[PDB]
Amino acid sequence: MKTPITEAIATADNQGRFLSNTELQAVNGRYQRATASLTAAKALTGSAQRLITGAAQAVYNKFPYTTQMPGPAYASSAIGKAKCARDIGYYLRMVTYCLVVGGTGPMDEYLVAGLEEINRSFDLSPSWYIEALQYIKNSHGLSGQVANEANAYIDYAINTLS
Amino acid sequence: MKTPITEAIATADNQGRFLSNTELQAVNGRYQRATASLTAAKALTGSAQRLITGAAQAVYNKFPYTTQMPGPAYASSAIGKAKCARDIGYYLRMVTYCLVVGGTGPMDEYLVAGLEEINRSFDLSPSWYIEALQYIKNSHGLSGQVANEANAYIDYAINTLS
Amino acid sequence: MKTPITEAIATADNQGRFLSNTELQAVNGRYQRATASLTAAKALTGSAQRLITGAAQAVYNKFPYTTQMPGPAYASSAIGKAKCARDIGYYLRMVTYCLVVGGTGPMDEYLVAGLEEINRSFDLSPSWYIEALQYIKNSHGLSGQVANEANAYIDYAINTLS
Amino acid sequence: MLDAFAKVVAQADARGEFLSNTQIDALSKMVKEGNQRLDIVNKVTSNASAIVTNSARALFAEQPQLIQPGGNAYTSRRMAACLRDMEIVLRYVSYAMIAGDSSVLDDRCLNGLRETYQALGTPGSSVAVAIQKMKDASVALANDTTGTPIGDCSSLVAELAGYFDRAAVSVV
Amino acid sequence: QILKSTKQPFLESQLRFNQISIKDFIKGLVLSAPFRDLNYNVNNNYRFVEICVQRVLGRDIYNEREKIAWSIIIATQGLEGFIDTLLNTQEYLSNFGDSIVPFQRRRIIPQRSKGE
Amino acid sequence: MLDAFSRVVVNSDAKAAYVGGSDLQALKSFIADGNKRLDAVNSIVSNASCMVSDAVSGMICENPGLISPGGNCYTNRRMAACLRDGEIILRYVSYALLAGDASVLEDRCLNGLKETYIALGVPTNSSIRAVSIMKAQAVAFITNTATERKMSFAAGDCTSLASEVASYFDRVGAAIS
Amino acid sequence: MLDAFSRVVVNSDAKAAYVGGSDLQALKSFIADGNKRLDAVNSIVSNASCMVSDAVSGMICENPGLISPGGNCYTNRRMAACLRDGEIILRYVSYALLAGDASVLEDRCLNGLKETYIALGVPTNSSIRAVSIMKAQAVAFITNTATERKMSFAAGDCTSLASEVASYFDRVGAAIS
Amino acid sequence: MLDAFSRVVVNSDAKAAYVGGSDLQALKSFIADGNKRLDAVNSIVSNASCMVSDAVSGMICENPGLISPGGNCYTNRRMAACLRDGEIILRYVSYALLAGDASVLEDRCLNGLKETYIALGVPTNSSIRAVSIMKAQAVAFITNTATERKMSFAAGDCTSLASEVASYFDRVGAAIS
Amino acid sequence: GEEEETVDKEAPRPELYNKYFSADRLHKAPEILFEYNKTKYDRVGVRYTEVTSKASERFFPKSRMNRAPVIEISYREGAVSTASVSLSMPEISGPPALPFPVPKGDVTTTMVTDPTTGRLKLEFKVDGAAVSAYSDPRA
Ligand SMILES: *C(=C)C1=C(C)[C@@H](Cc2[nH]c(/C=C3N=C(/C=C4\NC(=O)[C@H](C)[C@H]4[C@@H](*)C)C(C)=C\3CCC(=O)O)c(CCC(=O)O)c2C)NC1=O
Ligand SMILES: *C(=C)C1=C(C)[C@@H](Cc2[nH]c(/C=C3N=C(/C=C4\NC(=O)[C@H](C)[C@H]4[C@@H](*)C)C(C)=C\3CCC(=O)O)c(CCC(=O)O)c2C)NC1=O
Ligand SMILES: *CC[C@H]1/C(=C/c2[nH]c(/C=C3N=C(/C=C4\NC(=O)C(CC)=C4C)C(C)=C\3CCC(=O)O)c(CCC(=O)O)c2C)NC(=O)[C@@H]1C
Ligand SMILES: *C[C@@H](*)[C@H]1/C(=C/c2[nH]c(/C=C3N=C(/C=C4\NC(=O)C(CC)=C4C)C(C)=C\3CCC(=O)O)c(CCC(=O)O)c2C)NC(=O)[C@@H]1C
Ligand SMILES: *C[C@@H](*)[C@H]1/C(=C/c2[nH]c(/C=C3N=C(/C=C4\NC(=O)C(CC)=C4C)C(C)=C\3CCC(=O)O)c(CCC(=O)O)c2C)NC(=O)[C@@H]1C
Ligand SMILES: *[C@@H](C)[C@H]1/C(=C/C2=NC(=C\c3[nH]c(C[C@H]4NC(=O)C(C=C)=C4C)c(C)c3CCC(=O)O)/C(CCC(=O)O)=C2C)NC(=O)[C@@H]1C
Ligand SMILES: *[C@H](C)[C@H]1/C(=C/C2=NC(=C\c3[nH]c(C[C@H]4NC(=O)C(C=C)=C4C)c(C)c3CCC(=O)O)/C(CCC(=O)O)=C2C)NC(=O)[C@@H]1C
Ligand SMILES: *[C@H](C)[C@H]1/C(=C/C2=NC(=C\c3[nH]c(C[C@H]4NC(=O)C(C=C)=C4C)c(C)c3CCC(=O)O)/C(CCC(=O)O)=C2C)NC(=O)[C@@H]1C
Ligand SMILES: *[C@H](C)[C@H]1/C(=C/C2=NC(=C\c3[nH]c(C[C@H]4NC(=O)C(C=C)=C4C)c(C)c3CCC(=O)O)/C(CCC(=O)O)=C2C)NC(=O)[C@@H]1C
Ligand SMILES: *[C@H](C)[C@H]1/C(=C/C2=NC(=C\c3[nH]c(C[C@H]4NC(=O)C(C=C)=C4C)c(C)c3CCC(=O)O)/C(CCC(=O)O)=C2C)NC(=O)[C@@H]1C
Ligand SMILES: *[C@H](C)[C@H]1/C(=C/C2=NC(=C\c3[nH]c(C[C@H]4NC(=O)C(C=C)=C4C)c(C)c3CCC(=O)O)/C(CCC(=O)O)=C2C)NC(=O)[C@@H]1C
Ligand SMILES: *[C@H](C)[C@H]1/C(=C/c2[nH]c(/C=C3N=C(/C=C4\NC(=O)C(CC)=C4C)C(C)=C\3CCC(=O)O)c(CCC(=O)O)c2C)NC(=O)[C@@H]1C
Ligand SMILES: C=CC1=C(C)[C@@H](Cc2[nH]c(/C=C3N=C(/C=C4\NC(=O)[C@H](C)[C@H]4CC)C(C)=C\3CCC(=O)O)c(CCC(=O)O)c2C)NC1=O
Ligand SMILES: C=CC1=C(C)[C@@H](Cc2[nH]c(/C=C3N=C(/C=C4\NC(=O)[C@H](C)[C@H]4CC)C(C)=C\3CCC(=O)O)c(CCC(=O)O)c2C)NC1=O
């Protein structure tokens, strides 16, 4: 788990160093943006069921074959649509964990590592999840620097699927 | 490339030993199954334009969105349909390269290694190419052990994508 | 002990691979030199009793000093000859063991591995030992390709001491 | 590693004699079935990603408590490491199909596999029920009459079954 | 070559179970079949010694005689006999040991900004 | 301890199903072949004094360095113990075949006899030469092809059963290995 | 049940057969002195391998010209073919002992053997010397008067069966004269 | 596949080919009494080695001047050629039993057979005497009326296929008449 | 010297048989095979191979070649309820081959027992076989 605090510890531990004024501004700058990032995590938490089901329908409008084609990898059934809504809820949960810790720690560990082994095995396309995340990027309805923190960790997830 | 000859050579300079009779039998079994292999590579090369344009149409009949979606990754243009047809030209050419040398050497060198990083960067779905290869696997018209050798390198190309 | 089956397995495992059609052909050639090597080491046991001391007299009539020298390391008295119905029977044993497995397996680890330490510190010079099985290579009766496969692992054992 | 020819070498060395003529006519029976061994390993490894993903899919259907959050196979790191070990047994069983004995399967893959799983905490009764899906998806795959002419291959499926039940009793 | 086909997913799991060390993990990577066909079939024995001293030992080659003095180890007892006699040198043990992934030692001079 | 009848229950437990007719078909054929296995193990335990005779007097003629003064079967307690150490391990596999499961062999003896034996100092290659001398001693008795004593059975072919006691005794030897 | 024995020897292929406890009582009752005769065939075939190894080497020990270059015990396939001709007649004379006649000996083994040996260049008077050792070696095993070996038996004589093989071994020597 | 039976023969090339279980009943529906006819070949080819040896030795022991020095069954290359010559006419009459017609026997074996025997000096009156013993054997084996070897069969009559092979042996004798 | 007879061919054979029998189609006949075991996998097959013979087969044909009836008897003392006789005739091979003749000592060689061959040793009766009688340290 990389945080700003568990990264400046690690460069202090590389040099045998007591925590100098170099490593006391890397952890101070997390505190001047933990205000704006924890309101964005609180806002995305409350509007989760609007954003999950709205993005699951915006996938199905762009890619209509996924609701039509038979076989278990598609959203053409009841349980096929339930597992797609589970997956965007897994994706949106790791965005809010990154706004708590201030970096891409929890989606590196719990989401990204080992993801391409799944998407090739179970025949799931990585462009089904760009369209789900590009909905959430410009339909969360945030503004200012609260939107700047949520839009940083959303397109980190787009770049590890692209 | 890994042929049965070049892996019998490879275990010799593993130890740094001379070529014994624990490698002459490996080349001996290659010469047995090369007479049912070059009769397969001849027939796939002779019916290559029938197999390629029939396999492009099997993708377009199963996935009709690819013929009409706008965007660069789909075969809805004139140049989108040409890049699709040379891809199934590339998948048939590495099968007849692998039947000639008797092993999975050319498609390890040219197809397989690095395939995931270009299907993710260019948004190419790997279920398109399994449908292009499943048309070839039961409509080449071969019969017998000549059919049994073409259905082991087409099936090796499928299990990379699957 | 390196069977030609077992290095099709061990050079499918260090790359982390299923048994493809490359290594399936190398075990087919082990099934092609099977019958032409199995008449060799069967009938070499059927004529084994002449070949032990009929080859020993092809050393003492080459070397008269080996019965005449005062030393423990020769067949001069009656105790050295009892080692000489044992120490060249081990050469006759492992040349039968190589024709079971179709490769140079058992004598690569039982015989040849760490042998100059045994030779220099007993003064058991292999000028007797090359001529100990040089009587075997021309008076053992395996004609045809049964001769050449039985003579294939004899002169591998010649060249390891020469 | 050892195959069947390497058995009776080391089963007569240790005592140090030969092998004898009454054993090798059983071993020259084995090369009559040498061509019915290599099709059958080609039947397994051609479908080597369709026996894995069709049986992990039928594993999480009957056991939803592994893909639920807080489960063993929950995250994408531990889903990929569940499909890794489901294919690892498919390699070392088919290695024991081509060789003639178990002794590369239970020396490189089953020697401490359940005590790997007791230390990590994975349900060792539940890996056996994924393997027994892969047993039934491969024995019923290796009885097709397409691609080969018809003949009885029964003993190899018992030999092919007999290493699939050897991984079914290794992991519990 | 950190592609999907060039990864070693069974060697990765034995590091995570603490079965093998880092020194046994570097030895599995030079003996890996992607390292043979991409970095050993396309140069000779006198350039491959320049690879396995720059990357493994982390230093440059001393002079050109050391490439001559090391290249007969690969041609006599093999690449698997070449790595363990290179991983048992004192230059590998006295600053990497049994637990450190190697690196290029002293690439830059501390007052400067250019270096090597 | 596991039973083969217990083996289908925990198979049907994490699966959370009932018992169907599908996996029931293995166990109903196990009933009618139960008497054939019951005709096997009675002759294993009734010629057991011969099988522990040829366990230890047979392995000592092919390495006599243990009766030498200084060996690992020299004194008459270690002479007594090697007669005793082998007559428990065939008593355990007589339990193990009636359940059918090897886990009763594992938890009782085969979890940790190897870690004792290098602190008890005995060699393991001598042990597996004494394990395997009971292996072919066993499989003669189940088939009735033993030379000096031929016993009463019925007529058939228990070579599926005769592989199973050979499927135990290698894991007896691999545990010490 | 000698028809079950004769159908084994008439099928001209490799086929195993064996006798249970009920039909062995039919064997012991149909053949007179079956407690004596089945001992007498067992005393030969327990040591049949040493009988063929001694006698043709005793044929070498009196006729040393067979292992000369140009002799008929040179070129070790041909030396083993004399050993293969050693072992067939011992199995054929034991079944001739067991059936109580030579009618299976004449057609399957003794018909045309003199014409076979003079067409193959076989020295037939040397084989007379080799088979006369077999007449002495079978008598000393039936009477248990062997100098180096002594097997346990029931008490009594076997001199009818000791004289019966001398009738059977002279039929071989008359066939090849 | 009767043509693929013939395509073993007519391409003059040494292969091996078979007929499976589903492919048997296509031939068994086509060929009338195929359960009799496959028994009729298997009664012959299980004793195909013994059929040539009683045929050639009855030719020898009735015509004793053939094994004279100067006779045509001297000089053991010439004896082994005559035993080879009785084998090829046995396999061709066995394949004529399978195919149901002699038209592959007439051209491959009997065509040119007459004057190729006076090309080498074969006494053809002995050769008609040689094949007539094989005519007496094949009516004994198919009807299971051999005097020494009976075989197990399904119960019934086989007198048409007894007469067909006895018709097919007469085409061999008329080819060398 | 074990087979110094590898090609020897004194057949006369003038070329007057070639217009009626070709060289490739010479002594070749269809041999019929039978996997008849009353089973579902029972196959009939024919193959067309070269026919060879030897001169011995007037009285000892290839099915009856070297097939002699062997007897195995299991008998414990007073154990006739479990005692048995068996009978078979396999293709019976002889014992292992006769040795060298040897001078006056040496170490002749042997072999015995059921499982394996494990051969003897021999200084004409006495069987030395690696006891190391030359045991002379120099203190
Ligand atoms: C020359 C080198 C040479 C001979 C000449 C010949 C000597 C010889 N030995 C016998 C008699 C027997 N051989 C027997 C065989 C065996 N005895 C055993 O105990 C084992 C089982 C087996 C193999 C060694 C037996 C049982 C006899 C009869 C009793 C006896 O020992 O005498 C003969 C025949 C008797 C005669 O006419 O002299 C001869 C010629 N062997 C040589 O090696
Ligand atoms: C002279 C020395 C000599 C003969 C005269 C001639 C005897 C002979 N035998 C037959 C008949 C058959 N031979 C058969 C072959 C065999 N019988 C078997 O049981 C085995 C399997 C096989 C090889 C020995 C068969 C089946 C018969 C028919 C049954 C019968 O005996 O009648 C004949 C032809 C019939 C006749 O007498 O006209 C002859 C002439 N062989 C000699 O060596
Ligand atoms: C009919 C197939 C579907 C399809 C194809 C399509 N592919 C591309 C682009 C690329 N494909 C490759 C693949 C390879 N190149 C190789 O050299 C080899 C090995 C011999 C392989 C497998 C690559 C590298 C590209 C990009 C470069 C290029 O060739 O242009 C495209 C163009 C996409 C783009 O963004 O340029 C298409 C349209 N698409 C379909 O719709 C068909 C279903
Ligand atoms: C043909 C006779 C020649 C001969 C024989 C001889 N050998 C020895 C002693 C040894 N030989 C070995 C070598 C091996 N032993 C093995 O088991 C194997 C297989 C792995 C090999 C390669 C060893 C270790 C010994 C010593 C132990 C032993 O006695 O076997 C001796 C005795 C020498 C002594 O001083 O003890 C003899 C006479 N030597 C000759 O000179 C003959 C030509
Ligand atoms: C269907 C999946 C089941 C499951 C799998 C699971 N396994 C692990 C972890 C390991 N498994 C092994 C065993 C092997 N690794 C190998 O490389 C080989 C062959 C050489 C074997 C036999 C090891 C060593 C580990 C730990 C290392 C690793 O692979 O990660 C895990 C945990 C993964 C993690 O990172 O913790 C899972 C989830 N477990 C289940 O619940 C399924 C039933
Ligand atoms: C009690 C006597 C049993 C019995 C046991 C069986 N023993 C079998 C083989 C065998 N027996 C021994 C022991 C003996 N022979 C020797 O050479 C030595 C000295 C080294 C001794 C003490 C050995 C070594 C073996 C071979 C086993 C091996 O080493 O692999 C055996 C199988 C043969 C058979 O009978 O078919 C059995 C059944 N025999 C009995 O029937 C009584 C009840
Ligand atoms: C003979 C074939 C062996 C061998 C036997 C010896 N075993 C010795 C001691 C010993 N063994 C055990 C384990 C024993 N208890 C069990 O319940 C079971 C079965 C499951 C077994 C095998 C124990 C606990 C001990 C120690 C007993 C004690 O300390 O009281 C032994 C030595 C006796 C001693 O040291 O006094 C021998 C000789 N060892 C051999 O060398 C061969 C291979
Ligand atoms: C002759 C070569 C022997 C000899 C033979 C005698 N055996 C006598 C009784 C007897 N024989 C056997 C073994 C035999 N009968 C069988 O049923 C079977 C195999 C299934 C065999 C091998 C037995 C078991 C017995 C009974 C022993 C007893 O009463 O306790 C016997 C007495 C007369 C008779 O019964 O025929 C004789 C003379 N005895 C000899 O001294 C030579 C060496
Ligand atoms: C004349 C040569 C025989 C005889 C022949 C009969 N056989 C009859 C039935 C039958 N035959 C066979 C064996 C045959 N069929 C095969 O498919 C194969 C090889 C794969 C062979 C060798 C079988 C299996 C059967 C069926 C037996 C049953 O299930 O009952 C038969 C009855 C009429 C018929 O079915 O054709 C006859 C007359 N029987 C004789 O008496 C002489 C000796
Ligand atoms: C044996 C019972 C006869 C007899 C037989 C001999 N035949 C000899 C040579 C020979 N036979 C054939 C015909 C045979 N070979 C075939 O390839 C075919 C069918 C395709 C058949 C029927 C041929 C062709 C030849 C040799 C000439 C050639 O190869 O072109 C033969 C050898 C004579 C010699 O070498 O001096 C014998 C003895 N002769 C008899 O006396 C009885 C009646
Ligand atoms: C050894 C003590 C003799 C001797 C023996 C040789 N026999 C050779 C070949 C041979 N032997 C037989 C006899 C045996 N086998 C059988 O199948 C039957 C009957 C069922 C019997 C009695 C036969 C048939 C043959 C083959 C002859 C043929 O093919 O016609 C032989 C080698 C000759 C060869 O391989 O060509 C030898 C050396 N010869 C001797 O010098 C002593 C006296
Ligand atoms: C939804 C947008 C599209 C879709 C979804 C779909 N997904 C699955 C199955 C799986 N998805 C995963 C993915 C993850 N698991 C994780 O733990 C994480 C990190 C938190 C991720 C990203 C896995 C492991 C599976 C398989 C197991 C499961 O059942 O969930 C399916 C089912 C596939 C099947 O074969 O059953 C579906 C249908 N597919 C669509 O059609 C939508 C467009
Ligand atoms: C390199 C890879 C490779 C293989 C996999 C085998 C494949 C193979 N099998 C057969 C031939 C055959 N193969 C089978 C096998 C089967 N039939 C069944 O019902 C079972 C499903 C299956 C066993 C697993 C049968 C029954 C035959 C015909 C009988 C025979 O072999 O004689 C043949 C024709 C030659 C022959 O008959 O032997 C070949 C080439 N050989 C190879 O070189
Ligand atoms: C009181 C104590 C007691 C026993 C001893 C067993 C006794 C026993 N054995 C078998 C029966 C049998 N046992 C065997 C076993 C064998 N036959 C062989 O050829 C092999 C040598 C051997 C092991 C492979 C066979 C083949 C049958 C017949 C099949 C069967 O009905 O079980 C049967 C069923 C048929 C019958 O009633 O006889 C019974 C009750 N059960 C008991 O309750």
PDB file of C-alpha atoms in Angstrom, chain H residues 20-122:
ATOM      1  CA  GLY H  20     -13.580 -51.219 -36.044  1.00  0.00           C
ATOM      2  CA  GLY H  21     -16.732 -52.148 -34.204  1.00  0.00           C
ATOM      3  CA  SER H  22     -19.162 -49.782 -35.905  1.00  0.00           C
ATOM      4  CA  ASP H  23     -17.438 -50.532 -39.203  1.00  0.00           C
ATOM      5  CA  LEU H  24     -17.854 -54.276 -38.664  1.00  0.00           C
ATOM      6  CA  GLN H  25     -21.662 -54.313 -38.872  1.00  0.00           C
ATOM      7  CA  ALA H  26     -21.607 -52.527 -42.224  1.00  0.00           C
ATOM      8  CA  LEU H  27     -19.597 -55.471 -43.537  1.00  0.00           C
ATOM      9  CA  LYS H  28     -21.623 -57.956 -41.489  1.00  0.00           C
ATOM     10  CA  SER H  29     -24.915 -56.742 -42.943  1.00  0.00           C
ATOM     11  CA  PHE H  30     -23.428 -56.809 -46.445  1.00  0.00           C
ATOM     12  CA  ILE H  31     -21.667 -60.182 -46.330  1.00  0.00           C
ATOM     13  CA  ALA H  32     -24.168 -62.967 -45.687  1.00  0.00           C
ATOM     14  CA  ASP H  33     -23.407 -65.206 -42.646  1.00  0.00           C
ATOM     15  CA  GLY H  34     -20.566 -62.926 -41.600  1.00  0.00           C
ATOM     16  CA  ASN H  35     -20.655 -64.315 -38.077  1.00  0.00           C
ATOM     17  CA  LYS H  36     -20.059 -67.708 -39.663  1.00  0.00           C
ATOM     18  CA  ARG H  37     -17.525 -66.332 -42.132  1.00  0.00           C
ATOM     19  CA  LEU H  38     -15.376 -64.502 -39.593  1.00  0.00           C
ATOM     20  CA  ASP H  39     -15.417 -67.708 -37.569  1.00  0.00           C
ATOM     21  CA  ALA H  40     -14.437 -69.560 -40.741  1.00  0.00           C
ATOM     22  CA  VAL H  41     -11.290 -67.510 -41.265  1.00  0.00           C
ATOM     23  CA  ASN H  42     -10.401 -67.538 -37.555  1.00  0.00           C
ATOM     24  CA  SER H  43     -10.620 -71.322 -37.472  1.00  0.00           C
ATOM     25  CA  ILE H  44      -7.996 -71.374 -40.228  1.00  0.00           C
ATOM     26  CA  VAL H  45      -5.572 -68.595 -39.284  1.00  0.00           C
ATOM     27  CA  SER H  46      -5.328 -69.702 -35.666  1.00  0.00           C
ATOM     28  CA  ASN H  47      -3.834 -72.937 -37.005  1.00  0.00           C
ATOM     29  CA  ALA H  48      -2.190 -71.545 -40.133  1.00  0.00           C
ATOM     30  CA  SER H  49       1.276 -72.553 -38.950  1.00  0.00           C
ATOM     31  CA  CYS H  50       0.215 -76.123 -38.195  1.00  0.00           C
ATOM     32  CA  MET H  51      -1.693 -76.480 -41.468  1.00  0.00           C
ATOM     33  CA  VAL H  52       1.403 -76.088 -43.629  1.00  0.00           C
ATOM     34  CA  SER H  53       3.526 -78.519 -41.599  1.00  0.00           C
ATOM     35  CA  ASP H  54       1.228 -81.532 -41.777  1.00  0.00           C
ATOM     36  CA  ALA H  55       0.704 -80.726 -45.466  1.00  0.00           C
ATOM     37  CA  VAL H  56       4.364 -80.669 -46.424  1.00  0.00           C
ATOM     38  CA  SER H  57       5.444 -83.644 -44.294  1.00  0.00           C
ATOM     39  CA  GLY H  58       2.672 -85.834 -45.641  1.00  0.00           C
ATOM     40  CA  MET H  59       4.026 -84.960 -49.065  1.00  0.00           C
ATOM     41  CA  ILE H  60       7.502 -85.932 -47.829  1.00  0.00           C
ATOM     42  CA  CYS H  61       6.550 -89.151 -46.042  1.00  0.00           C
ATOM     43  CA  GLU H  62       4.509 -90.405 -49.005  1.00  0.00           C
ATOM     44  CA  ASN H  63       7.021 -89.336 -51.689  1.00  0.00           C
ATOM     45  CA  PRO H  64      10.373 -90.137 -50.045  1.00  0.00           C
ATOM     46  CA  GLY H  65      12.520 -89.350 -53.079  1.00  0.00           C
ATOM     47  CA  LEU H  66      11.843 -85.635 -52.700  1.00  0.00           C
ATOM     48  CA  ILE H  67      14.282 -85.347 -49.771  1.00  0.00           C
ATOM     49  CA  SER H  68      16.954 -87.264 -51.678  1.00  0.00           C
ATOM     50  CA  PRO H  69      20.217 -85.570 -52.687  1.00  0.00           C
ATOM     51  CA  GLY H  70      19.003 -84.484 -56.079  1.00  0.00           C
ATOM     52  CA  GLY H  71      15.399 -84.303 -54.889  1.00  0.00           C
ATOM     53  CA  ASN H  72      13.577 -81.001 -54.716  1.00  0.00           C
ATOM     54  CA  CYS H  73      13.204 -80.912 -50.958  1.00  0.00           C
ATOM     55  CA  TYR H  74      16.890 -81.189 -50.245  1.00  0.00           C
ATOM     56  CA  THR H  75      19.330 -78.233 -49.645  1.00  0.00           C
ATOM     57  CA  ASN H  76      17.648 -76.386 -46.752  1.00  0.00           C
ATOM     58  CA  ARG H  77      17.282 -73.058 -48.604  1.00  0.00           C
ATOM     59  CA  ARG H  78      15.131 -75.126 -50.975  1.00  0.00           C
ATOM     60  CA  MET H  79      13.286 -76.720 -48.049  1.00  0.00           C
ATOM     61  CA  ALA H  80      12.532 -73.313 -46.514  1.00  0.00           C
ATOM     62  CA  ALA H  81      11.335 -72.058 -49.890  1.00  0.00           C
ATOM     63  CA  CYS H  82       8.833 -74.920 -50.098  1.00  0.00           C
ATOM     64  CA  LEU H  83       7.562 -74.131 -46.614  1.00  0.00           C
ATOM     65  CA  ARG H  84       7.275 -70.509 -47.695  1.00  0.00           C
ATOM     66  CA  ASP H  85       5.428 -71.647 -50.841  1.00  0.00           C
ATOM     67  CA  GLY H  86       2.771 -73.444 -48.814  1.00  0.00           C
ATOM     68  CA  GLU H  87       2.226 -70.347 -46.693  1.00  0.00           C
ATOM     69  CA  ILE H  88       1.399 -67.957 -49.557  1.00  0.00           C
ATOM     70  CA  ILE H  89      -1.200 -70.320 -50.979  1.00  0.00           C
ATOM     71  CA  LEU H  90      -2.673 -70.630 -47.481  1.00  0.00           C
ATOM     72  CA  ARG H  91      -3.002 -66.883 -46.943  1.00  0.00           C
ATOM     73  CA  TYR H  92      -4.447 -66.358 -50.404  1.00  0.00           C
ATOM     74  CA  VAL H  93      -7.093 -69.015 -49.857  1.00  0.00           C
ATOM     75  CA  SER H  94      -7.806 -67.456 -46.453  1.00  0.00           C
ATOM     76  CA  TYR H  95      -8.276 -64.044 -48.024  1.00  0.00           C
ATOM     77  CA  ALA H  96     -10.495 -65.681 -50.650  1.00  0.00           C
ATOM     78  CA  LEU H  97     -12.599 -66.975 -47.764  1.00  0.00           C
ATOM     79  CA  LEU H  98     -12.902 -63.426 -46.442  1.00  0.00           C
ATOM     80  CA  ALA H  99     -13.599 -61.719 -49.752  1.00  0.00           C
ATOM     81  CA  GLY H 100     -15.984 -64.440 -50.916  1.00  0.00           C
ATOM     82  CA  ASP H 101     -14.473 -64.727 -54.403  1.00  0.00           C
ATOM     83  CA  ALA H 102     -11.368 -66.316 -55.839  1.00  0.00           C
ATOM     84  CA  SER H 103     -10.729 -63.439 -58.259  1.00  0.00           C
ATOM     85  CA  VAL H 104      -7.929 -62.005 -56.138  1.00  0.00           C
ATOM     86  CA  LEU H 105      -6.528 -65.524 -55.716  1.00  0.00           C
ATOM     87  CA  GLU H 106      -6.500 -66.238 -59.471  1.00  0.00           C
ATOM     88  CA  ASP H 107      -4.405 -63.306 -60.652  1.00  0.00           C
ATOM     89  CA  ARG H 108      -2.084 -62.751 -57.692  1.00  0.00           C
ATOM     90  CA  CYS H 109      -1.208 -66.380 -57.018  1.00  0.00           C
ATOM     91  CA  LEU H 110      -2.467 -68.791 -59.655  1.00  0.00           C
ATOM     92  CA  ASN H 111      -1.671 -66.686 -62.726  1.00  0.00           C
ATOM     93  CA  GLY H 112       1.587 -67.872 -64.235  1.00  0.00           C
ATOM     94  CA  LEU H 113       1.901 -70.552 -61.552  1.00  0.00           C
ATOM     95  CA  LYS H 114       1.914 -73.525 -63.936  1.00  0.00           C
ATOM     96  CA  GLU H 115       5.024 -72.980 -66.037  1.00  0.00           C
ATOM     97  CA  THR H 116       6.951 -71.225 -63.274  1.00  0.00           C
ATOM     98  CA  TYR H 117       7.196 -74.582 -61.470  1.00  0.00           C
ATOM     99  CA  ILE H 118       8.660 -76.434 -64.440  1.00  0.00           C
ATOM    100  CA  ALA H 119      10.867 -73.366 -64.729  1.00  0.00           C
ATOM    101  CA  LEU H 120      12.447 -74.570 -61.483  1.00  0.00           C
ATOM    102  CA  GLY H 121      11.597 -78.266 -61.630  1.00  0.00           C
ATOM    103  CA  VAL H 122       8.842 -78.539 -59.029  1.00  0.00           C
TER     104      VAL H 122
END
